[PDB]
């Protein structure tokens with residue numbers, strides 16, 4: 001009578017041993033760039049989740065009792081939640097540190113502010129910003145700041161007996177109300193000369209109109225004297241605090257925190273369910289998974305939210321394109337869940353079939369995380385150590 005359990009137990013043991021091997025390779029090479037360069041704590045949380053997926057088999061195969069019924073209810077949702085919260089936090093981290101995007105609008109005649117913007121654009125590019133540099137002469141005011149996390153306005157000072165903004169910049173300055181500067185993080189720069197009474201008067205003028213509109217001036221204006229090439233060290237130095245506006249780093253403790261919050265969401269659903277509907281029997285558990293689908297809905301949200309963010313952040317090259325492999329993991333995950341959920345529905349009337357299918361789908365969900373995400377990571381660590389130094 002235990003024949004039906006041989007196949008699922010074999011998968012579960014092979015899968016558990018693979019997950020342990022992956023953890024072993026990772027912990028042995030813990031300070032290595034492949035393991036350190038991304039969400040290290042998140043990849044250990046993820047492995048724990050994959051280990052729990054395989055272990056769920058032993059709970060499905062077990063004879064129903066108060067303890068087994070508790071474990072099943074609590075575990076099915078939790079196992080998945082650990083995986084999909086670690087994965088969502090990984091893509092969320094990628095989306096903040098590389099998702100960030102900046103816009104540079106400059107007004108230049110002799111190419112001085114046009115050079116300042118080029119060297120600023122390079123420094124921001126180096127900080128994982130999708131930088132877009134645009135001359136003011138070829139800029140239309142209406143909704144120009146929309147979609148941008150950071151906006152840098154560059155302008156030289158002109159006018160003989162008084163201050164005057166650079167020729168190309170004036171229309172943009174005149175219709176500044178229309179760009180969407182309210183609540184936007186901004187910073188001004190510009191080239192001028194100290195032989196002139198009002199050194200960089202254009203910067204002061206732009207800073208002040210931005211202030212009235214309700215813009216968030218992150219840093220004080222960069223006012224350069226003479227040739228910008230000789231003040232290059234201060235330009236790049238100014239770029240060090242403008243890049244700071246949108247965080248370029250989420251701390252290891254913060255990653256763990258947001259991941260633990262999302263897992264806690266599942267816990268609260270399935271613990272609250274257990275206290276309302278007391279676990280027990282009388283062959284079968286008292287409260288089936290179909291009696292309350294709130295645990296499943298939460299994991300479907302996590303999968304949906306994750307797959308959205310994974311696709312949006314796919315082209316990121318950080319940590320040997322881990323973003324691409326999270327993509328594959330997630331596209332494969334959707335396919336498993338879209339194929340199995342209808343099977344469970346149309347098969348709900350045969351318990352041994354439900355149990356057996358659950359052993360296959362939960363383990364397959366684990367195997368996909370090991371195959372798409374970890375196997376490529378493993379191949380570099382073990383067979384390409386020169387690429388891991």
Ligand SMILES: Cc1cc2nc3c(=O)[nH]c(=O)nc-3n(C[C@H](O)[C@H](O)[C@H](O)COP(=O)(O)O)c2cc1C
Nearest residue numbers: 109110111112113156157158191192193196199200
């Ligand atoms: C007609 C004229 C007016 C200027 N007025 C000012 C001024 O009031 N304040 C200032 O700091 N620089 C002033 N300058 C200096 C220019 O801003 C400087 O040459 C600048 O580096 C040009 O930058 P751009 O290539 O970005 O246009 C003036 C220069 C000229 C010839």
Ligand SMILES: Cn1cc(-c2cc(C(N)=O)nc3cc(CN4CCO[C@H](C(F)(F)F)C4)ccc23)cn1
Nearest residue numbers: 076077289290295296299337341344345348361362
């Ligand atoms: C890949 N994979 C996901 C799971 C899984 C996961 C979860 C969860 N807690 O996150 N809860 C499940 C509940 C059930 C019960 N069905 C009874 C009849 O059908 C119903 C519906 F609506 F889905 F059709 C639901 C079945 C499978 C569940 C297993 N494998």
